[PDB]
Amino acid sequence: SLGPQVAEGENVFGVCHIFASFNDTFVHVTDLSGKETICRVTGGMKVKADRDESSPYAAMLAAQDVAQRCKELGITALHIKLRATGGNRTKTPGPGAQSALRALARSGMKIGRIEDVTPIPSDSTRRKGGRRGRRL
RNA sequence: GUUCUAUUUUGUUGGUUUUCGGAACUGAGGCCAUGAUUAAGAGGGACGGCCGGGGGCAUUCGUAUUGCGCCGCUAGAGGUG
Known part of the structure; x- marks a missing residue:
């Protein structure tokens, strides 16, 4: 809750791992x-309904x-590490990834570098599903 | 050269060997226009370099998932129309 930074000189850097699944969205700020x-x-x-947890509004x-919780400390700039389910x-x-990114950009967090930390497998094991798949 | 024999014949009665001709064995020869068509846009093989997620064995690398050990903060997290 105490920042030794000078205001005019530099910014304080953190990172946010934006996890964007098709059912929920994690916005997690670490050092x-x-x-x-x-x-x-x-x-x-934020939204008490399971069907719109991955919604852009949520x-x-x-x-x-x-x-708001990050401005309560004073970290100014965030790098962005986007991560899908993988x-x-x-x-x-x-759909929540771009909405949360634009929401924090309009809220006023200084964008650093955006990169991908999606756990892309080299050569994975067998997918959840049969020989025919999730038919519906 | 070695072995066997049908036999014409020594004017006719008795034996042996040969000229003559027969079958088999063997040696020095003369000659052949002396004798092997080509290598199939058949095939096999050898040889040269190159190629190939061809096969086996050993070694090695990568990440994902699951689980465990340590740390930070939160009441939610999976999943579905």
Whole structure:
């Protein structure tokens, strides 16, 4: 809750691991190591319905709550590490990722570098599903 | 050269060997236009370099998932129309 930084000189850097699944969105702000966390609120903590946890409105509320909790400390700039579900499952991030990113950008967090930390397998094991798949 | 024999014949009665001709064994020879068509846009093989997620054995690398050990903060997290 105490920052030794000078205001005009530099910015304080952190990182946010934006996990974008097709059912929930994690916005998790840690330090440069990643070991020490700061804030982690989800879409399900903000909206009390399971069907719109990965919604852009819930992701916007989670990004605004993360940005408010981060301005309560004083970290100014965040690097962005986008992460989908990964593994043998899908590698496309959900709809909440761009909404939470734009929400924290409009809230006023200084964007550093954006990169991908999606756990893309080299050569994975067998996908959840039979020989024919999740037919519906 | 070695072995066997049908036999014409010594004017006719008795034995042996040969000229003559027969079958088999063997040696020095003369000659052949002296004798092997080609290598199949058949095939096999050898040889040269190159190629190939061909096969086996050993070694080695990668990440994902699951689980465990340590740390930070939160009441939610999976999953579905």
